[PDB]
Design a binder for this molecule. Structure first.
Ligand SMILES: CCNC(=O)NC[C@H]1COCc2nc3cc(F)ccc3n21
Ligand SMILES: CCNC(=O)NC[C@H]1COCc2nc3cc(F)ccc3n21
Ligand SMILES: CCNC(=O)NC[C@H]1COCc2nc3cc(F)ccc3n21
Length: 340
């Protein structure tokens, strides 16, 4: 990195630490918003499109049921997610605008990104050209350079978590597994196709798992399917730990070389985790045409501009059963979520 990048990252870490040490809390409430539509769902939570009543602005509100968070043993992960999101700031990360809790739920009110998930766009077109995959990959490389310099591991890279904005740039969402780690960590988390071998083998692992996941993402963007695909998790895990991969013949030689270095089973040999860190990736011949500054400054014309009618359009997200959001008259799990 040149000194200007070093100085940028030093400032970025100072600004992160100030918010990390003194987190914002309780900056909105539920009856300040109208409920519009469910944008996505899960085991302990739900993401809703909402409209702020006074300003008219739209947001994506993630709602977690405290009792379900406790039962699924996600308390620490949920506290990590909110504490990290209120402290980070980067062009390719979805912004947290407000957060609050009530007797029943935890709420994170995020910017709403109307272009949909990368996953939908990838599945609909089949695969991305190498330049198109490279444009998105470059944004992930910069985002992981930022997060890793703050000692954060992201741990949930997959196409569903990359939203496409109006300008065709990626914004990364879902910090549910992100953690501040200055050395190793041990939790089994992540989607099967994206897990590094050291996670599957129950080892203490580090930020190298995010570089592995980038290799899986680039492969899947350029092929249309992930490199260790199989019908059941145990078979996926066997392929991941094997040390072999098959590349489509249409992949360029430079793409294959980059992917063999990201998908290196030995974490001590994996690109992103060597002495030169991220620069082995940024200087790789597959990225030779990438202007890293221009990508950061959002000056590159994107390959694809999502079609949508306005900031309240939900057409790029799919339809889910609409369930209500209840708030008990009795406080649940107050102690567990005191810091939220
Ligand atoms: C039928 C439409 N109902 C609302 O607009 N209700 C507004 C408030 C209070 O009532 C329960 C409730 N659940 C919500 C979920 C949201 F995502 C946003 C606001 C929500 N509210
Ligand atoms: C399957 N996996 C996902 O769908 N993962 C993304 C989910 C969870 O992470 C935060 C988040 N914010 C969203 C905003 C949306 F409009 C739609 C989905 C959203 N998600
Ligand atoms: C003000 N900002 C600068 O003057 N430069 C920082 C930007 C633009 O330049 C290339 C670049 N690479 C980065 C990698 C990071 F992790 C974070 C920011 C990065 N930038």
């Amino acid at each position: 990195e040149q000194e200007s990048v070093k100085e940028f990252l030093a400032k970025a870490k100072e600004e992160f630490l100030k918010k990390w040490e003194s987190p914002s809390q309780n900056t909105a409430q539920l009856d300040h918003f109208d409920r519009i539509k469910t944008l996505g769902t899960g085991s302990f939570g739900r993401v809703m499109l909402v409209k702020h009543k006074e300003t008219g602005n739209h947001y994506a509100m993630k709602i977690l049921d405290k009792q379900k968070v406790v039962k699924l043993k996600q308390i620490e992960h949920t506290l990590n997610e909110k504490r990290i999101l209120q402290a980070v700031n980067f062009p390719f990360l979805v912004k947290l605008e407000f957060s609050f809790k009530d007797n029943s739920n935890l709420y994170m009110v995020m910017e709403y990104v109307p272009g949909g998930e990368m996953f939908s766009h990838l599945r609909r077109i089949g695969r991305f050209s190498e330049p198109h995959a490279r444009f998105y990959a470059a944004q992930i490389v910069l985002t992981f350079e930022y997060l890793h310099s703050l000692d954060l591991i992201y741990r949930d890279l997959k196409p569903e978590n990359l939203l496409i904005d109006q300008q065709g740039y990626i914004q990364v969402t879902d910090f549910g597994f992100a953690k501040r780690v200055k050395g190793r960590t041990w939790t089994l988390c992540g989607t099967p196709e994206y897990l590094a071998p050291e996670i599957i083998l129950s080892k203490g692992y580090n930020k190298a798992v995010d570089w592995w996941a980038l290799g899986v993402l680039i492969y899947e963007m350029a092929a249309g399917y992930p490199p260790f695909f199989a019908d059941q998790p145990i078979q996926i895990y066997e392929k991941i730990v094997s040390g072999k991969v098959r590349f489509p013949s249409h992949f360029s030689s430079d793409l294959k070389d980059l992917l063999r270095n990201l998908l290196q089973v030995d974490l001590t040999k994996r690109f992103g985790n060597l002495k030169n860190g991220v620069n082995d990736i940024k200087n790789h011949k597959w990225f030779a045409t990438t202007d890293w500054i221009a990508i950061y400054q959002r000056k590159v014309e994107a390959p694809f501009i999502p079609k949508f009618k306005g900031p309240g359009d939900t057409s790029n997200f799919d339809d889910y059963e609409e369930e209500e959001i209840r708030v008990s008259i009795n406080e649940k799990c107050g102690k567990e979520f005191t810091e939220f």
